[PDB]
Amino acid sequence: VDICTAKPRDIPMNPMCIYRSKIPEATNRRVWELSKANSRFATTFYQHLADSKNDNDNIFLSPLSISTAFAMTKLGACNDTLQQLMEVFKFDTISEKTSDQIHFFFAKLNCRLYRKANKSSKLVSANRLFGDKSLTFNETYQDISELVYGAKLQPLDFKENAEQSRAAINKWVSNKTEGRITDVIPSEAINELTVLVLVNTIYFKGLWKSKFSPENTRKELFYKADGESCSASMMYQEGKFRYRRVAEGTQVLELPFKGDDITMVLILPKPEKSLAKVEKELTPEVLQEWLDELEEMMLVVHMPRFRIEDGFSLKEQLQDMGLVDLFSPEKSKLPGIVAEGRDDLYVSDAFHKAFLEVNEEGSEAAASTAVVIAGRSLNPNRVTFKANRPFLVFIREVPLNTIIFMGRVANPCV
């Protein structure tokens, strides 16, 4: 039956290699743990990423999507490759059983995230495997991915139609993300020696609990660091919201969607202060403190009606975060993928692309993560606009305390 009600002993799926080792009501402790882990990676990754970008740049990702995809990749890992994945993604900072049962509890967390009855806001996810038509993949490997991640294996012809296969993958990702994410894998990323491609997609579309009125939305010039300008449709509202002015005058505002199950957190540093201090001290612990301090208050909310998108490769960051072997054609270990015992597999490169849009009605967001086993290790775009005065955005799920999307909006103009 569905793994949303099953227990580890009901369907004890056997992974390739074994790892070398209050809370909310009606919530299984271990699922809560997984949330802590994923959040511990969310914050950490952002810090490395925000470190490799100009403070006046937009940043937008879905740590959830990245974690899900890499946990999927973890099925075929083994030895030091596996040890690295566990550590980097915080899968080792939890109890023994949960650590040794990641996939199953990820299935459970996901069940809670996307299969929750009576859903006021739309949150859906889709996973998928794309493998070369000529190879013979491990049956158990497929079965477990399909069972736990709902990721079926679609055969594509990378061997002779690499580029065409790429467009196919992207078209699938667009389909799942409502046409928001249409180009996750860059051109020439996939080539003749490509074996498999693991993909995850997350899509959120909710309505504000307290919507904004378009007759109050105005326009004003936004001044960029360089000296230029652009038009920004600044939304206005007045109502009660959980707010809190913290250390050094940093404002924290929460915008709950219909149902309060999911909410948007906005962190605005002091009127003429660097967000850098905030970002550097970003820990799930601090994030929790802020939200715990928020007190429902009456206030005037001003926020731009905008749209941002951010796409990038994950290789550089993850390596600087501990993941080395997985990308090394000499030290990588992925024995549990193809039945042919081809233990020469390595992840060539990984990509991510997110989308964010906000208006008087609500906020839409989509994200994807494409992991390519064997291919073209290219270095994507190294330049994007640097506007000015950015604020941090978080799209979290209240009960599970999970960070769905997270980023920094530096350019609100469109």
Ligand X SMILES: CO[C@H]1O[C@H](COS(=O)(=O)O)[C@@H](O[C@@H]2O[C@@H](C(=O)O)[C@@H](O[C@H]3O[C@H](COS(=O)(=O)O)[C@@H](O[C@@H]4O[C@H](C(=O)O)[C@@H](O[C@H]5O[C@H](COS(=O)(=O)O)[C@@H](OC)[C@H](OC)[C@H]5OS(=O)(=O)O)[C@H](OC)[C@H]4OC)[C@H](OS(=O)(=O)O)[C@H]3OS(=O)(=O)O)[C@H](OC)[C@H]2OS(=O)(=O)O)[C@H](OS(=O)(=O)O)[C@H]1OS(=O)(=O)O
Ligand Y SMILES: *[C@@H]1O[C@H](CO)[C@@H](O)[C@H](O)[C@H]1NC(C)=O
Please identify which residue in 51, 115, 134, 179 interacts with ligand Y, judged by CB under 6 A: 179
Detail the residues annotated as belonging to a binding site for heparin.
Answer: 32, 112, 128
Detail the residues annotated as belonging to a binding site.
Answer: 32, 112, 128
Is position 124 an interface residue for ligand Y (rule: CB under 6 A)?
Answer: no
Query: For residues 263 and 332, which CB has a smaller minimum distance to ligand Y in the complex?
Result: 332
Measure the CA–CA gap between 240 and 210, rounded to whole angstroms.
9
Nearest alpha-carbon partner for 317 in 46, 80, 90: 46
Measure the CA–CA gap between 309 and 367, rounded to whole angstroms.
10
Q: What CA dihedral angle connects 50, 56, 62 and 63, to 10 degrees?
A: 10
| Main-chain dihedrals φ then ψ at residue 388, nearest 5 degrees | 180, 165
Which one of ligand X, ligand Y, none is in contact with 15 (Cβ closer than 5 to 8 A by kind)? Answer: ligand Y
Which one of ligand Y, ligand X, none is in contact with 27 (Cβ closer than 5 to 8 A by kind)? Answer: ligand X
Query: Alpha carbon 85 to chain centroid distance?
Result: 16
Please identify which residue in 27, 52, 175, 213 interacts with ligand Y, judged by CB under 6 A: 175
| Binding residues for ligand X (CB under 6 A) | 7-9, 26-31, 95-98, 108, 112
Please identify which residue in 311, 336, 375, 412 interacts with ligand Y, judged by CB under 6 A: 336
Minimum CB separation of residue 402 from ligand X in Å reads 11
Minimum CB separation of residue 336 from ligand Y in Å reads 4
CB-based contact 36:285 (threshold 8 Å): no
Q: Which residues pair with 392 in a beta bridge?
A: 267, 408
Minimum CB separation of residue 95 from ligand X in Å reads 4
Is position 141 an interface residue for ligand Y (rule: CB under 6 A)?
Answer: yes
Please identify which residue in 11, 135, 207, 339 interacts with ligand Y, judged by CB under 6 A: 339
Which one of ligand Y, ligand X, none is in contact with 249 (Cβ closer than 5 to 8 A by kind)? Answer: none
Measure the CA–CA gap between 399 and 336, rounded to whole angstroms.
35
Is position 137 an interface residue for ligand Y (rule: CB under 6 A)?
Answer: no
Number of other CB atoms surrounding residue 118 within 10 Å: 6
Which one of ligand Y, ligand X, none is in contact with 76 (Cβ closer than 5 to 8 A by kind)? Answer: none
Q: Burial letters for 66-87: b for 16+ Cβ neighbours within 10 Å, e otherwise?
A: bbbbbbbbbbbbbbbbbbbbbe
